[PDB]
Amino acid sequence: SHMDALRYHIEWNRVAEPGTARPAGRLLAVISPDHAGAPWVTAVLDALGPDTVRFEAKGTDRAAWAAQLAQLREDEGEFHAVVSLLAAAEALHTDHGSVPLGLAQTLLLAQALGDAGLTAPLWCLTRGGVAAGRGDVLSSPVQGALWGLGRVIGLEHPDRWGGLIDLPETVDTRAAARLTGLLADAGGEDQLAIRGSGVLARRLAHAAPAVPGSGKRPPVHGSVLVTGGTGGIGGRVARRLAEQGAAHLVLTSRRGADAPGAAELRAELEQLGVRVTIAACDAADREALAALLAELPEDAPLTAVFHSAGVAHDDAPVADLTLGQLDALMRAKLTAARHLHELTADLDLDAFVLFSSGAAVFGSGGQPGYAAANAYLDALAEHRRSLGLTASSVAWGTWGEVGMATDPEVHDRLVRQGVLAMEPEHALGALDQMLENDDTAAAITLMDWEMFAPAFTANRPSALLSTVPEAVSALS
Ligand SMILES: NC(=O)C1=CN([C@@H]2O[C@H](COP(=O)(O)OP(=O)(O)OCC3O[C@@H](n4cnc5c(N)ncnc54)[C@H](OP(=O)(O)O)[C@@H]3O)[C@@H](O)[C@H]2O)C=CC1
């Protein structure tokens, strides 16, 4: 099927045991000084050895760090690699309430390295930011956001990007040796998870063909909340839910009833017999969300959430992105989804569906803020499954007809790259296959691999795509 052919999923496959020698040259370790106490942080610093130079990245000051780094690189000469432990800073930034401090500090470290002329490859370490291997628990969705930023750094600064490595809970000596071995030579891999049974790396595969009933999807009923539900994709999802018999759709956006197209949307939905509530309110306002949930009918309790609230604009290259831009991109994604998760965790929902993007799953040049925000969604869905709660993340490709991609501009960058506009009916039917399977994560995208693979790999290989045969064929 055509709908099957839009669905892909991320897998983690075993790779080679690394060598036994640590890096010959000197490592530079970067530490968040208020967040240096986690066990894995001390285990990593121990594994890097006492000869490793240590840089405490204090606060968020690009210019100060550029100066400090330039001084270090003057004194030492070229480093073998930069190893960042900034991801351990999960606390929100004091001035940007939707940006984890470690995310802010990572962006500014990537900036200041470039400013100071350090060219050693940057490796970003996380602990629990991916779900890798049968039974693996994604414990930190906040650290998971950093992977969407890293993948973009790999596309914008391939020559000075090492990669991302997720550590296990307990970094024992076998885990330490895998780490230091990868830092010496990672065999062309750059998205890695170190686990008790081996080193795994991240891979994209075609999803298994749809099996109706396998996931035991309950019938759509009760109240269903679609955030961004007046927006392009949210609207077409609400119309599908309505076709499928929802009792009550609750559609939100910051403009609510004043959003473009809302009256027409409400009328088309109501002709289907559905009760329609359209509310103005910001998905990152916890008190407004709570108030909205408090209003639901006894006869129509919340059964499902579809989180389509989002903006992509006002992003910038890694070298230029500000923290205020990053905060505005994170707000509807990390802040709003955290709220949705927390206020629905006891409700036994049938579906909790987060709309992510291919920018998070692949990386996309020019979109670091949006990739980090959407990668947090994907990680939160995995996290929620670990809690025994239902959750789905869908990393859409480009939609045709409706939504944020419908305009020649930076629709054309993507299209020239092989990421094609999907027909909405096909995208919706593929999402329906995913929910019928009860799959936790998918990318749903129409790709021309012959165009995409060579373009995406021109500066650097991508081990991610070696499990897509069309990409292997395009590179042959
Ligand atoms: N269209 C596509 O090709 C792709 C879409 N996606 C994702 O799908 C989702 C929907 O995208 P699409 O329908 O195309 O985009 P739209 O711009 O058409 O809709 C997005 C919307 O979310 C609402 N929104 C934005 N910020 C907030 C907020 N803080 N609180 C509540 N609502 C908010 C907007 O209304 P308002 O401005 O009034 O708040 C609008 O309803 C987005 O999350 C997007 O990132 C991912 C990849 C591709």
Short mmCIF file of N, CA, C and O and ligand atoms in Angstrom, two decimals, residues 227-235 252-256 259-260 281-284 307-312 331-333 336 355-359 370 374 377 394-400 402-406 422, ligand 1:
data_model
loop_
_atom_site.label_atom_id
_atom_site.label_comp_id
_atom_site.label_asym_id
_atom_site.label_seq_id
_atom_site.Cartn_x
_atom_site.Cartn_y
_atom_site.Cartn_z
N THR A 227 -5.28 20.09 20.18
CA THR A 227 -4.63 21.34 20.30
C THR A 227 -4.13 21.72 18.87
O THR A 227 -3.80 20.87 18.03
N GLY A 228 -4.07 23.02 18.60
CA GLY A 228 -3.87 23.45 17.18
C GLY A 228 -4.95 22.96 16.26
O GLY A 228 -4.73 22.67 15.09
N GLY A 229 -6.16 22.75 16.86
CA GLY A 229 -7.25 22.04 16.18
C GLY A 229 -8.00 22.87 15.15
O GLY A 229 -8.72 22.30 14.32
N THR A 230 -7.84 24.19 15.24
CA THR A 230 -8.30 25.10 14.17
C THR A 230 -7.26 25.24 12.97
O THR A 230 -7.57 25.90 11.98
N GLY A 231 -6.01 24.73 13.17
CA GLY A 231 -4.87 24.89 12.26
C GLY A 231 -5.05 23.90 11.12
O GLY A 231 -6.04 23.24 11.05
N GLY A 232 -4.10 23.85 10.18
CA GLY A 232 -4.25 23.07 8.96
C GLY A 232 -4.37 21.58 9.26
O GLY A 232 -5.40 21.00 8.96
N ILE A 233 -3.31 20.99 9.81
CA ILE A 233 -3.36 19.54 10.04
C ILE A 233 -4.40 19.19 11.12
O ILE A 233 -5.13 18.22 10.99
N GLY A 234 -4.39 19.96 12.22
CA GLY A 234 -5.42 19.77 13.32
C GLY A 234 -6.84 19.77 12.83
O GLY A 234 -7.67 18.92 13.24
N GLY A 235 -7.23 20.74 12.00
CA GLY A 235 -8.50 20.68 11.29
C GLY A 235 -8.92 19.47 10.49
O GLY A 235 -10.06 19.03 10.62
N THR A 252 -8.47 23.64 20.19
CA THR A 252 -7.89 24.82 20.77
C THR A 252 -6.80 25.48 19.87
O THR A 252 -6.23 24.86 18.95
N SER A 253 -6.53 26.77 20.13
CA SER A 253 -5.39 27.44 19.52
C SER A 253 -5.33 28.78 20.21
O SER A 253 -6.27 29.14 20.98
N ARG A 254 -4.25 29.51 20.01
CA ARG A 254 -4.20 30.78 20.74
C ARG A 254 -5.33 31.73 20.29
O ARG A 254 -5.81 32.51 21.10
N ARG A 255 -5.74 31.70 19.01
CA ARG A 255 -6.80 32.59 18.51
C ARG A 255 -8.22 32.04 18.80
O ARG A 255 -9.22 32.79 18.79
N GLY A 256 -8.31 30.76 19.10
CA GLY A 256 -9.59 30.07 19.22
C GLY A 256 -10.62 30.33 18.13
O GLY A 256 -10.36 30.11 16.92
N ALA A 259 -9.59 32.14 15.00
CA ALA A 259 -8.58 31.61 14.11
C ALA A 259 -9.10 31.58 12.69
O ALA A 259 -10.31 31.36 12.48
N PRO A 260 -8.21 31.81 11.69
CA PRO A 260 -8.64 31.70 10.28
C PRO A 260 -9.40 30.38 10.02
O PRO A 260 -8.94 29.30 10.43
N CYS A 281 -6.87 29.25 23.85
CA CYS A 281 -5.93 29.25 24.88
C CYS A 281 -4.68 28.52 24.51
O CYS A 281 -4.65 27.49 23.75
N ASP A 282 -3.67 29.08 25.12
CA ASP A 282 -2.29 28.77 24.85
C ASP A 282 -2.01 27.44 25.50
O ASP A 282 -2.26 27.25 26.71
N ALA A 283 -1.47 26.51 24.68
CA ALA A 283 -1.23 25.14 25.12
C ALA A 283 -0.16 25.11 26.27
O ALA A 283 -0.13 24.22 27.08
N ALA A 284 0.61 26.16 26.40
CA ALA A 284 1.64 26.21 27.45
C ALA A 284 1.16 26.87 28.75
O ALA A 284 1.91 26.97 29.74
N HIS A 307 -1.99 16.44 19.85
CA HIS A 307 -1.26 17.65 20.08
C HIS A 307 -0.63 18.20 18.77
O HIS A 307 0.49 17.84 18.42
N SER A 308 -1.38 19.08 18.10
CA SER A 308 -0.95 19.59 16.74
C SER A 308 -0.47 21.09 16.94
O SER A 308 0.07 21.74 16.05
N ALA A 309 -0.62 21.62 18.15
CA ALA A 309 -0.16 23.04 18.40
C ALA A 309 1.32 23.13 18.08
O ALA A 309 2.12 22.25 18.46
N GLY A 310 1.72 24.17 17.38
CA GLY A 310 3.14 24.27 16.96
C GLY A 310 3.39 25.40 16.00
O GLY A 310 2.50 25.86 15.26
N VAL A 311 4.60 25.96 16.11
CA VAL A 311 5.07 26.86 15.11
C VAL A 311 6.47 26.43 14.64
O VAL A 311 7.22 25.88 15.39
N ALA A 312 6.81 26.74 13.38
CA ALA A 312 8.12 26.45 12.84
C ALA A 312 8.95 27.73 12.54
O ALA A 312 10.18 27.62 12.31
N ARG A 331 8.06 26.42 23.28
CA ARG A 331 6.91 26.65 24.21
C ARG A 331 5.70 25.72 23.90
O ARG A 331 5.16 25.11 24.82
N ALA A 332 5.24 25.65 22.63
CA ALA A 332 4.09 24.81 22.34
C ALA A 332 4.35 23.32 22.31
O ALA A 332 3.43 22.48 22.16
N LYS A 333 5.61 22.98 22.35
CA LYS A 333 6.04 21.65 22.21
C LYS A 333 6.39 21.03 23.59
O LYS A 333 5.56 20.27 24.15
N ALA A 336 3.91 22.78 26.56
CA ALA A 336 2.49 22.38 26.39
C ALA A 336 2.37 20.84 26.53
O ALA A 336 1.46 20.38 27.26
N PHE A 355 2.33 15.45 17.67
CA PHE A 355 2.75 15.64 16.28
C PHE A 355 4.16 16.29 16.20
O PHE A 355 4.35 17.46 16.57
N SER A 356 5.13 15.46 15.86
CA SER A 356 6.50 15.82 15.73
C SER A 356 6.77 16.10 14.24
O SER A 356 5.85 16.40 13.50
N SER A 357 8.03 16.01 13.75
CA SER A 357 8.34 16.41 12.38
C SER A 357 9.57 15.60 11.95
O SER A 357 10.43 15.20 12.76
N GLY A 358 9.73 15.49 10.65
CA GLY A 358 10.97 14.91 10.11
C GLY A 358 12.15 15.70 10.45
O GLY A 358 13.24 15.14 10.53
N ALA A 359 12.00 16.98 10.76
CA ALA A 359 13.17 17.80 11.19
C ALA A 359 13.75 17.16 12.45
O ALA A 359 14.97 17.16 12.60
N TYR A 370 13.29 24.02 16.02
CA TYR A 370 12.16 23.17 15.74
C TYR A 370 12.52 21.69 15.91
O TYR A 370 11.72 20.86 16.32
N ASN A 374 10.66 19.24 18.59
CA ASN A 374 9.90 18.04 18.18
C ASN A 374 10.53 16.73 18.65
O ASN A 374 9.83 15.81 19.05
N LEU A 377 9.04 15.80 21.90
CA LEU A 377 7.80 15.06 21.75
C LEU A 377 8.02 13.59 21.55
O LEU A 377 7.37 12.75 22.16
N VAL A 394 4.12 11.13 16.02
CA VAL A 394 4.12 11.07 14.56
C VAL A 394 4.94 12.16 13.98
O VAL A 394 4.57 13.33 14.17
N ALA A 395 6.01 11.77 13.31
CA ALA A 395 6.95 12.80 12.78
C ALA A 395 6.55 12.95 11.31
O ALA A 395 6.92 12.16 10.42
N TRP A 396 5.76 13.99 11.09
CA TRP A 396 5.26 14.17 9.74
C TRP A 396 6.34 14.68 8.83
O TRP A 396 7.19 15.58 9.20
N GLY A 397 6.23 14.26 7.57
CA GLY A 397 6.91 14.97 6.44
C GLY A 397 6.08 16.17 6.03
O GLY A 397 5.25 16.69 6.84
N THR A 398 6.12 16.53 4.76
CA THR A 398 5.46 17.72 4.23
C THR A 398 4.07 17.40 3.86
O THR A 398 3.85 16.47 3.09
N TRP A 399 3.10 18.15 4.41
CA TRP A 399 1.71 18.04 3.92
C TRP A 399 1.46 18.98 2.75
O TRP A 399 1.87 20.16 2.73
N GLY A 400 0.68 18.44 1.81
CA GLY A 400 0.15 19.28 0.74
C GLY A 400 -1.17 19.86 1.22
O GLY A 400 -1.73 19.42 2.28
N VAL A 402 -2.89 21.87 3.08
CA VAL A 402 -3.21 22.59 4.31
C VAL A 402 -1.94 22.62 5.14
O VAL A 402 -1.09 21.71 5.04
N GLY A 403 -1.85 23.63 5.99
CA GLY A 403 -0.80 23.66 7.05
C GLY A 403 0.44 24.46 6.73
O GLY A 403 0.51 25.23 5.72
N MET A 404 1.44 24.30 7.59
CA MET A 404 2.64 25.19 7.58
C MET A 404 3.64 25.03 6.45
O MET A 404 4.65 25.80 6.41
N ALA A 405 3.41 24.03 5.58
CA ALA A 405 4.33 23.77 4.47
C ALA A 405 3.77 24.26 3.14
O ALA A 405 4.48 24.23 2.13
N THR A 406 2.51 24.74 3.17
CA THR A 406 1.82 25.14 1.93
C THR A 406 2.15 26.57 1.53
O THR A 406 1.43 27.52 1.89
N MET A 422 2.72 15.26 0.79
CA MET A 422 1.72 14.22 0.96
C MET A 422 0.26 14.71 0.69
O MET A 422 -0.10 15.84 1.00
N1 LIG B 1 2.30 20.89 7.78
C1 LIG B 1 3.37 20.05 7.72
O1 LIG B 1 3.89 19.77 6.65
C2 LIG B 1 4.02 19.57 9.00
C3 LIG B 1 3.51 19.76 10.27
N2 LIG B 1 4.11 19.34 11.42
C4 LIG B 1 3.50 19.58 12.79
O2 LIG B 1 2.04 19.40 12.76
C5 LIG B 1 1.38 20.37 13.60
C6 LIG B 1 0.29 21.17 12.92
O3 LIG B 1 0.95 21.80 11.82
P1 LIG B 1 0.06 22.55 10.69
O4 LIG B 1 -1.34 22.16 10.90
O5 LIG B 1 0.73 22.34 9.34
O6 LIG B 1 0.39 24.06 11.09
P2 LIG B 1 -0.64 25.32 11.31
O7 LIG B 1 0.17 26.63 11.35
O8 LIG B 1 -1.68 25.21 10.23
O9 LIG B 1 -1.32 24.99 12.71
C7 LIG B 1 -0.52 25.09 13.84
C8 LIG B 1 -1.39 25.72 14.89
O10 LIG B 1 -1.07 25.45 16.24
C9 LIG B 1 -1.64 26.55 16.92
N3 LIG B 1 -0.65 27.03 17.87
C10 LIG B 1 0.58 27.59 17.70
N4 LIG B 1 1.14 27.86 18.92
C11 LIG B 1 0.25 27.51 19.85
C12 LIG B 1 0.22 27.51 21.26
N5 LIG B 1 1.23 28.04 22.00
N6 LIG B 1 -0.92 27.08 21.85
C13 LIG B 1 -1.97 26.58 21.17
N7 LIG B 1 -1.98 26.55 19.85
C14 LIG B 1 -0.85 26.99 19.19
C15 LIG B 1 -1.98 27.53 15.77
O11 LIG B 1 -3.01 28.47 16.12
P3 LIG B 1 -2.59 29.86 16.92
O12 LIG B 1 -1.47 30.51 16.06
O13 LIG B 1 -3.93 30.62 16.84
O14 LIG B 1 -2.09 29.59 18.33
C16 LIG B 1 -2.56 26.64 14.66
O15 LIG B 1 -3.90 26.22 15.02
C17 LIG B 1 2.48 21.33 14.10
O16 LIG B 1 2.82 20.96 15.45
C18 LIG B 1 3.67 21.06 13.24
O17 LIG B 1 4.93 21.31 13.92
C19 LIG B 1 5.24 18.67 11.35
C20 LIG B 1 5.82 18.43 10.11
C21 LIG B 1 5.23 18.85 8.90
#
